[PDB]
Amino acid sequence: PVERIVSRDIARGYERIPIPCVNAVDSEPCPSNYKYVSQNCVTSPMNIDRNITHLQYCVCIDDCSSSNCMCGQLSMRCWYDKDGRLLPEFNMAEPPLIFECNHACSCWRNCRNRVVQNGLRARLQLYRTRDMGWGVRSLQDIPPGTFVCEYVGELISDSEADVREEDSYLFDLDNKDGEVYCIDARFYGNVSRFINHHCEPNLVPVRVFMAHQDLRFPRIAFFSTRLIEAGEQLGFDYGERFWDIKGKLFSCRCGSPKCRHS
Amino acid sequence: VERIVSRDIARGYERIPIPCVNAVDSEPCPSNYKYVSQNCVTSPMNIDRNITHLQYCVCIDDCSSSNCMCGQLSMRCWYDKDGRLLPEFNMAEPPLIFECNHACSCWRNCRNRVVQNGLRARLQLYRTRDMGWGVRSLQDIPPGTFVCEYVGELISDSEADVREEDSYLFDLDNKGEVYCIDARFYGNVSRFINHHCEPNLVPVRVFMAHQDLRFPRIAFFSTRLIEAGEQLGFDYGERFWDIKGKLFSCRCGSPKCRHS
Ligand SMILES: *CCC(=O)Nc1nc(NC2CCN(C(C)C)CC2)c2cc(OC)c(OCCCN3CCCC3)cc2n1
Ligand SMILES: C=CC(=O)Nc1nc(NC2CCN(C(C)C)CC2)c2cc(OC)c(OCCCN3CCCC3)cc2n1
Ligand SMILES: [Zn+2]
Ligand SMILES: [Zn+2]
Ligand SMILES: [Zn+2]
Ligand SMILES: [Zn+2]
Ligand SMILES: [Zn+2]
Ligand SMILES: [Zn+2]
Ligand SMILES: [Zn+2]
Ligand SMILES: [Zn+2]
Numbered sequence: 384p385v386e387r388i389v390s391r392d393i394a395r396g397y398e399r400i401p402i403p404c405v406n407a408v409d410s411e412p413c414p415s416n417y418k419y420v421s422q423n424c425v426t427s428p429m430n431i432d433r434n435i436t437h438l439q440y441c442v443c444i445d446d447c448s449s450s451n452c453m454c455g456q457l458s459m460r461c462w463y464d465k466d467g468r469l470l471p472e473f474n475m476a477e478p479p480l481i482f483e484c485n486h487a488c489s490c491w492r493n494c495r496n497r498v499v500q501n502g503l504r505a506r507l508q509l510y511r512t513r514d515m516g517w518g519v520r521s522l523q524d525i526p527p528g529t530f531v532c533e534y535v536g537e538l539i540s541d542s543e544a545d546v547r548e549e550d551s552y553l554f555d556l557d558n559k560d561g562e563v564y565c566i567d568a569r570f571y572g573n574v575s576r577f578i579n580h581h582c583e584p585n586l587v588p589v590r591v592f593m594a595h596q597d598l599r600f601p602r603i604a605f606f607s608t609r610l611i612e613a614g615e616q617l618g619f620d621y622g623e624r625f626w627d628i629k630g631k632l633f634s635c636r637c638g639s640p641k642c643r644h645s
Numbered sequence: 646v647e648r649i650v651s652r653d654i655a656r657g658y659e660r661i662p663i664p665c666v667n668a669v670d671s672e673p674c675p676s677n678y679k680y681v682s683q684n685c686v687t688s689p690m691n692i693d694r695n696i697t698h699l700q701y702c703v704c705i706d707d708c709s710s711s712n713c714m715c716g717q718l719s720m721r722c723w724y725d726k727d728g729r730l731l732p733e734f735n736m737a738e739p740p741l742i743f744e745c746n747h748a749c750s751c752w753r754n755c756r757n758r759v760v761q762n763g764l765r766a767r768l769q770l771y772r773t774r775d776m777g778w779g780v781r782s783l784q785d786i787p788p789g790t791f792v793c794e795y796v797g798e799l800i801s802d803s804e805a806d807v808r809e810e811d812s813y814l815f816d817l818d819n820k821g822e823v824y825c826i827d828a829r830f831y832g833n834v835s836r837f838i839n840h841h842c843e844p845n846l847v848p849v850r851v852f853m854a855h856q857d858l859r860f861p862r863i864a865f866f867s868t869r870l871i872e873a874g875e876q877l878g879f880d881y882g883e884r885f886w887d888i889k890g891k892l893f894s895c896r897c898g899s900p901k902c903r904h905s
Contacts, residue, residue, distance in 0.1 A: 395750075395751070395752040395753060396752040396753035396754050397747070397753045418748070420696075420747055421747070422747075424694075424696045424747075425694060425695065425696065426695055426696060426697055427695070428691075428693075428694075428695065430689070432689075433685075433686055433689070434686060434687055434688070434689065435681075435685045435686065435687060435831065436687055486658070486681055486682075486683075486685070487679070489656075490656070491656040491657045492656060492657030492658050493657050537696075571696065
């Protein structure tokens with residue numbers, strides 16, 4: 384049916400590569416019931432601790448590949464290799480918190496411990512499936528352990544989340560505490576909001592701290608669990624809380640043997 | 646000979662390196678401050694970052710139309726196709742510049758964005774015989790270019806009264822509750838720009854990602870062609886000289902020096 388380019392860039396140039404939208408299935412236009420934003424935003428205020436003196440920082444004189452780098456130690460160790468990919472020892476079943484370097488450290492902007500703060504770099508594409516509606520695919524091969532994209536959106540309270548109509552776009556940051564917050568990508572979001580569910584996922588979310596270290600508000604970075612080849616769709620485990628509510632209304636269709644919710 | 650005491654005082658945090666050189670005495674590159682490329686805070690500030698409180702344009706072109714809402718808030722958009730200020734721009738009393746932001750419909754490359762794209766000109770911190778440290782340009786800079794931003798620590802006027810050094814403060818006023826940029830403890834290369842009574846730089850107040858009028862950002866635009874090798878400088882104003890004029894006199898070397 385030929386692939387028509389319905390959008391040249393859904394980000395309007397706000398990323399370092401364009402994210403085009405294409406449709407070779409049906410009649411839907413490029414989605415527009417939302418505002419694309421490349422970084423997290425807020426409506427009602429959040430008291431994010433942006434005190435520069437409250438930041439923990441390293442004092443390294445190298446490229447922050449030493450074991451002495453404080454930011455690596457906060458991360459148990461620096462999990463990035465020279466190419467920006469996670470080392471094989473990284474346990475993607477129970478990922479650790481990643482503390483990248485910040486503006487209070489002594490290192491240079493090109494130190495090893497900086498990956499997510501460099502933005503989205505893979506060439507991705509929003510496309511229409513016959514299956515689950517919209518999905519996101521990669522246009523060239525992605526090696527294992529590469530940072531792909533961040534789950535960005537509007538930061539709200541768990542209270543403000545309970546009183547909003549649709550929950551299909553929430554992502555939860557720490558319920559294992561007292562006060563909890565989430566990211567609602569319904570009204571504002573990025574390309575991550577179109578990433579579909581998968582029972583054998585090629586992406587895992589990791590909690591990362593960069594410019595601040597308010598542990599109430601981590602940022603969600605998706606890394607590749609294996610090699611993603613050109614044309615492969617992306618996806619991640621939406622978690623059992625998605626399905627303990629929305630398995631009532633429909634089935635999953637990741638369409639692969641080891642499915643757990645079809 | 647000219648000693649290079651640092652290849653980049655920003656440690657790669659800017660688009661170009663800002664090296665530091667000394668060809669006078671033997672003092673090393675300054676280190677009693679923390680270099681930061683964007684404003685920072687110590688005590689918290691209630692900067693209104695509600696995305697829905699932003700005013701935005703809905704243009705379908707590159708925001709060179711006269712209909713751009715962000716140009717109207719600025720009286721008009723003062724940027725030409727090259728990102729320079731138009732000749733009509735009044736550098737005696739500059740107006741508030743509202744660039745486009747993440748709430749507008751335009752693309753990231755629209756005409757109405759200059760300061761939000763960062764530093765571009767080749768600058769260099771250098772040791773003078775006379776003024777201590779200064780900033781010079783390594784390239785010709787056409788009139789109306791954005792050169793650098795005055796960045797530092799955002800403080801209240803109350804907090805500024807109780808501080809020891811006041812020679813690094815910048816006033817951001819709406820007069821009421823006023824706020825200031827103190828570049829003493831945190832700041833960028835702007836903290837080293839010397840005063841000049843015939844300045845080749847003027848500060849303009851710009852709003853980009855937030856439009857809280859208590860915190861405008863301060864952008865330095867060239868008032869004329871700045872030739873390769875020339876030293877940067879802006880008018881500190883009378884509030885600085887009514888104070889520090891009692892202790893020393895200006896040594897800018899201008900035949901029209903008003904604080905000699
Ligand atoms: C922020 C605290 C929190 O856990 N919020 C939350 N709630 C829901 N469910 C409903 C409950 C009541 N609803 C109405 C009655 C108002 C509103 C919300 C919720 C549901 C999910 O799945 C449907 C969900 O998901 C988890 C992550 C799934 N992927 C992550 C990225 C996109 C979706 C999260 C939910 N969070
Ligand atoms: C900005 C805080 C504020 O809110 N008001 C305030 N206060 C000052 N000094 C106080 C200090 C304390 N002192 C007693 C209480 C001892 C009382 C006065 C200021 C001093 C200034 O330089 C002398 C000044 O220069 C602005 C010109 C531009 N800059 C940029 C680069 C250098 C010059 C502005 C000042 N602004
Ligand atoms: Zn380090
Ligand atoms: Zn560090
Ligand atoms: Zn580092
Ligand atoms: Zn499935
Ligand atoms: Zn416009
Ligand atoms: Zn605009
Ligand atoms: Zn615009
Ligand atoms: Zn003078």
